[PDB]
């Protein structure tokens, strides 16, 4: 069990040294085509990179590159893509990204504005009658409906690809209350929303993975797949207390660097799958 690990670590203030074991262990890959120049504006930061093995490449020829990974969790049976808020330039390359993998979902788990800053372009339109027009991967995008809610927003959204006119209907979960220092102070709308996003069939293998995002695309969206993995191995295993959460985030480590940001961000991840853990073990 881990909800005793939690007290002592709680107890003893260990989480900056946990951390760090978990900084040391980390794997390290080759960030190459990253780091070519002629990528250096595809790239909102120029310290977090996709590796080459895991990164996902568009479909065209002049550059595949977009900063995005695929995290593959090979005994849950769930599959993410983690990428970066997109740039002015690369919103065309994002929703291409989300046409050629078959996504059904986009979380976005930042707001557009944090610290007097952009942290993301604004990528999605915000009145159903002015649809926006992404000329360079010809592709149209148009906002069907909205529901705004207290600590979360959820949005219809049609993709048309204009060259073959298919279309496909998107949701984009876009969670608008992660303070802007810090973590939540409890877990319940995090878990909640999390929730909402399984219960639409986002996750889910008959479609693309599920496009993540927060600005860099490894700190809060860390937090989220964590999360969703171990709650999931936790209903698969015969013993739901053999799920060791720091190495589910060393195995997704191996898929993108640095998921998982601060020592806080590490402890509030432990606490949403401890309390998520009553929520599935049947304590409805
Ligand atoms: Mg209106």
């Not at 053999?242 to 601060?262: A, N, P």
């Amino acid at each position: 069990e881990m909800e005793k690990e939690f007290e002592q670590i709680d107890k003893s203030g260990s989480w900056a040294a946990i951390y760090q074991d978990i900084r040391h262990e980390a794997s390290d890959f080759p960030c190459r085509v990253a780091k070519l120049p002629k990528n250096k504006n595809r790239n909102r930061y120029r310290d977090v990179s996709p590796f080459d093995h895991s990164r996902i490449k568009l479909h065209q020829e002049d550059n595949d590159y977009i900063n995005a990974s695929l995290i593959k969790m090979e005994e849950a049976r769930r599959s993410y893509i983690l990428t970066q808020g997109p740039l002015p330039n690369t919103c065309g390359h994002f929703w291409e990204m989300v046409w050629e993998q078959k996504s059904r979902g986009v979380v976005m788990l930042n707001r557009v504005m944090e610290k007097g800053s952009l942290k993301c372009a604004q990528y999605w339109p915000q009145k159903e009658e002015k649809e926006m027009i992404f000329e360079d991967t010809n592709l149209k995008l148009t906002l069907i409906s909205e529901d705004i809610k207290s600590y979360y927003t959820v949005r219809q959204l049609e993709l048309e690809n204009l060259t073959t006119q298919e279309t496909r209907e998107i949701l984009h979960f876009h969670y608008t209350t992660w303070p802007d220092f810090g973590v939540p102070e409890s877990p319940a709308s995090f878990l909640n929303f999390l929730f909402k996003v399984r219960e639409s069939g986002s996750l889910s293998p008959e479609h693309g993975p599920v496009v993540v995002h927060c600005s860099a695309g490894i700190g809060r969206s860390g937090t989220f797949c964590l999360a969703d993995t171990c709650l999931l191995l936790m209903d698969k295993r015969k013993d739901p207390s053999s799920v060791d959460i720091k190495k589910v985030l060393l195995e997704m480590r191996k898929f993108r660097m640095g998921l998982i940001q601060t020592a806080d961000q590490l402890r509030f991840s432990y606490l949403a799958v401890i309390e998520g853990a009553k929520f599935i073990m049947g304590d409805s």
